[PDB]
Design a protein around this nucleic acid. Structure first.
Lengths: 186, 134, 186, 240, 77
RNA sequence: ACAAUCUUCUCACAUGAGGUGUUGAACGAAAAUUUAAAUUUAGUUUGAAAUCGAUUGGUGAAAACGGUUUUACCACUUUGU
């Protein structure tokens, strides 16, 4: 916690500039771990970033203000860029919106048209087209959608034996590796 | 009973000790002594428990026990040498006041005409004393 | 009960009910749990190279020589823990060892019964740790009997001067009268 | 001339050296400024250039070069500064081998002077510690980032030829001037050049912020070299 | 059942015990390895040992086994 | 997990400006400051050493009912975007 306190003030004081990997309207950020008895500013930022629990999956629009948040929890989260066809399968596999507050899967487009009818979204493909080419309804669709959960899969016999290991996740801007991490996510 | 465990790893708080000593029983008082003008701990922490028998049991657990590169010596001494100020200010967050920042607020301080007249009031008296020092 | 189990509990108790001489009495009082978890943490850097991956570095050493290159001119003197009973008796007589570790379960107990007496005479700080197999895991063996650090690099000298001070203060500084009286007869 | 509209040097300097001779049986320049010029305790020195070298060349220095250490170690021998720069210690080795507090206290006293590359000057505050970073032994930001003997020997000469100024949060600035064996003319010239550098990148308000400069020895009284007669008007300007 | 008579090992001996000098083979490269290297190095010239890069790349054409030889020479309402 | 993010330069320009970061304790100098108090503050010492000696100004963040207790580097850019 003293290391995180030093990491916060060092990155805040005289470090008010961000890297912000460009050429992407959206980014993929996942909290690969957590901090036991974390700072009050860290947990509130985790509540702000909607990654209240580790191994949660949600894509966020890339912005200068988002980059400030992307540099706030980078010690505890890993960022990157989302692939085109990977997100097409991610929504098809782990599309679980907060239907009436309950994280129910979007197994049919009728309920997708019922809730997102005001956003002119009736199908997942139309929702993905409003997500990849992020339109005005991208923020509202993510607001109605509960975040996905990318729990790392323990496949081999070593994955069940290692001491508190999760198939070796990394920290920072994975970029294409974030899509590779998504490729192994589901 | 009371104990004064020394050679603790630097940065260890009473919040850390009271979280650990409460697993041994009741932790009545605890004092992590620090530098008066700095506030950083002096690495000489004293803690008072409810029972001397429980405190004597804990001391048999932490007599020269290595913890993060230091053999932590913990021996519950008698209460005959215990004074009233042993637990002075216990269970209270210390105020490491930045007096330098206050002095920086003092050195660089807006003032009135008379407040500025008080600063240069003794400027000539100090110069006259130095004139007689030659 | 099977034919052998009723022996397997009785030789457990006849070591208790009889009069253990002070030479053997110290072989059951043993280094504790805590301070026997840092000794093996310091040793787990200085393991001998596994015989499979010593060859692996030898084929990588012998391939450049077959072209003209070399590394013997720049090879610094290696490090590891020193093991084997006959190699560690000569490392104590020559006053080269600095931390001798004695297993508490050597089956013919005469193999190590002179070591706590030899370490007391030659001034080599010593401790009796559990489970000969636990030493065996350190050096890639089935059952080790003893180990010894004779030279750690400059990295861990400051760590070693501290961890020995835990070994004398808990084993040698204590256990000072139970080694000087008979045991057993419980 | 530029400090307090007067050049009262080389006359009191001749008197102070005589006073040092008078009080026979180092000199620090205590200064009274307008306010706390130091915004914070800066754990770094200011390379004040002086014609008279107060750094004794008889002392030996150790340069904490960045890894790989085998490159600058040969360059230290290539520069022929073995008698000046004693031991080239790598940035990895200093952060790995010598880590105990007494060992650091021993490693501090094992050498005599210090040299540090500006490329790695910032990491010194944690690996070294207050055992070195508080016992009046601050690192010298040597500029050897190029990697040439011309860049090394010149920086080595600049290290031994120029004084260091450790700045921190304070309204009182002290300046170590030099030894008593220096000439009074050479000491006043070095003090005047120090004042030129002080008004450039040390004093926030320049010589106007410098109110009273009082020179003293290691144990002598602070004789005021120059006093700002218009400081009463400047005090009312700042404190308003 | 008396106490432990440590009449001899009470004190500490300060010297080493064996006095024969330190051999020269503890201050140089291990000449048993230098012989061992030359057995491997010779083996490369005769081509019986695949080398370290060959230790890597001959594992990579394998583990592709998906039917590389021919084995054969109610409805909706 | 006793693992962990303290700065092996940056930015401008080619000269600059920056690079915030250091056990404890004991020891002890003579000067300057700052606002009687504080600040800077020689030289020391020593095992990451220890057996009462705590100083007490200011900023607000959550529970609680405008008080109240909880932070164990919250410091003047002052405790939960």
């Amino acid at each position: 916690r003293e290391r995180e306190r030093i990491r916060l003030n060092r990155s805040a004081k005289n470090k008010g500039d961000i890297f912000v990997p460009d050429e992407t309207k959206l980014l993929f950020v996942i909290r690969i771990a957590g901090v036991k008895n974390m700072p009050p500013k860290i947990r509130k930022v985790l509540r702000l970033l909607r990654l209240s629990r580790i191994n949660n999956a949600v894509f966020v629009r890339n912005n200068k203000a988002v980059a400030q948040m992307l540099r706030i929890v980078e010690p505890y989260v890993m960022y990157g860029i989302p692939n085109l066809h990977s997100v097409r399968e991610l929504i098809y596999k782990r599309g679980f919106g907060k239907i009436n507050g309950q994280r129910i899967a979007l197994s049919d487009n009728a309920l997708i048209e019922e809730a997102l009818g005001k956003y002119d979204v009736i199908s997942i493909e139309d929702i993905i087209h409003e997500i990849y080419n992020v339109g005005s309804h991208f923020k509202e669709v993510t607001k109605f959608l509960w975040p996905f959960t990318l729990t790392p899969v323990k496949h081999s016999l070593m994955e069940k034996k290692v001491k508190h290991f999760n198939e070796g996740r990394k920290a920072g801007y994975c970029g294409e590796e974030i899509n590779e991490l998504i490729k192994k996510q589901v | 009973g009371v104990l004064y465990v020394g050679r603790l790893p630097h940065g260890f708080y009473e919040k850390q000790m009271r979280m650990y000593f409460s697993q041994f029983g009741p932790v009545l008082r605890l004092r992590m002594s620090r530098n008066r003008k700095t506030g950083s701990s002096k690495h000489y922490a004293f803690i008072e428990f409810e029972s001397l028998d429980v405190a004597n049991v804990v001391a048999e657990t932490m007599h020269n026990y290595l913890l993060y590169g230091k053999l932590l010596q913990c021996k519950v001494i008698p209460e005959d040498q215990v004074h009233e100020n042993m637990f002075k200010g216990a269970d209270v967050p210390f105020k490491r006041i930045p007096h330098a920042t206050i002095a920086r607020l003092q050195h660089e301080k807006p003032l009135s005409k008379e407040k500025a007249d008080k600063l240069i009031t003794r400027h000539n008296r100090k110069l006259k004393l130095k004139k007689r020092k030659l | 009960w099977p034919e052998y189990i009723r022996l397997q509990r009785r030789r457990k108790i006849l070591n208790l009910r009889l009069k253990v001489p002070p030479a053997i009495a110290q072989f059951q009082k043993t280094l504790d749990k805590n301070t026997a978890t840092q000794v093996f943490k310091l040793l787990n850097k200085y393991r001998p190279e596994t015989a499979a991956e010593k060859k692996q570095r030898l084929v990588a050493e012998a391939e450049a020589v077959a072209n003209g290159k070399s590394a013997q001119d720049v090879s610094k003197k290696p490090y590891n823990v020193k093991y084997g009973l006959n190699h560690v008796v000569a490392l104590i007589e020559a006053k080269k060892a600095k931390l001798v570790l004695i297993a508490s379960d050597v089956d013919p107990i005469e193999l190590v019964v002179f070591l706590p007496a030899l370490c007391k005479k030659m001034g080599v700080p010593y401790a009796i740790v559990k489970n000969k197999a636990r030493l065996g895991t350190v050096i890639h063996q089935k059952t080790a009997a003893v180990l010894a650090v004779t030279e750690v690099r400059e990295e861990d000298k400051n760590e070693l001067a501290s961890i020995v001070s835990a070994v004398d203060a808990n084993f040698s500084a204590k256990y000072d009268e139970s080694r000087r009286k008979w045991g057993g007869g419980i | 001339e530029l400090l307090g509209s007067d050049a009262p040097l080389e006359k009191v300097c001749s008197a102070l050296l005589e006073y040092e001779s008078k009080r026979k049986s180092p000199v620090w320049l205590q200064l009274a400024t307008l306010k706390f010029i130091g915004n914070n305790r800066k754990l770094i020195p200011y390379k004040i250039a002086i014609k008279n070298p107060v750094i004794p060349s008889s002392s030996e220095a150790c340069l904490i070069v960045k890894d790989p250490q085998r490159v600058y170690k040969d360059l230290v021998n290539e520069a022929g500064l073995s008698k000046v720069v004693t031991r080239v210690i790598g940035l990895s080795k200093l952060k790995a081998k010598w880590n105990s507090y007494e060992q650091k206290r021993q490693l501090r006293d094992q050498f005599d002077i210090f040299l540090a590359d500006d490329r790695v000057i910032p990491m010194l505050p944690r690996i070294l510690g207050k055992t070195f970073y508080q016992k009046s032994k601050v690192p010298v930001p040597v500029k050897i980032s190029k990697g040439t003997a011309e860049q090394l020997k010149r920086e080595v000469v600049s290290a031994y030829g120029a004084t260091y100024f450790n700045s921190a949060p304070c309204s009182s600035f002290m300046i170590k001037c030099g030894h008593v064996s220096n000439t009074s003319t050479e000491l006043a010239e070095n003090v005047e050049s120090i004042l030129q550098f002080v008004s450039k990148h040390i004093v926030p308000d320049g010589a106007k912020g410098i109110a009273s400069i009082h020179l003293k020895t290691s144990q002598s009284i602070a004789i005021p070299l120059w006093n700002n007669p218009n400081l009463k008007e400047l005090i009312a300007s700042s404190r308003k | 059942y008396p106490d432990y008579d440590d009449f001899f090992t009470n004190t500490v001996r300060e010297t080493p015990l064996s006095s024969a000098p330190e051999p020269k083979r503890r201050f140089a490269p291990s000449k048993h390895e230098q012989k061992r290297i030359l057995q491997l190095a010779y083996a490369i010239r005769k081509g019986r040992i695949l080398t370290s890069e060959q230790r890597a790349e001959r594992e990579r054409e394998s583990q592709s086994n998906y039917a590389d030889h021919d084995l054969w020479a109610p409805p909706s309402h």
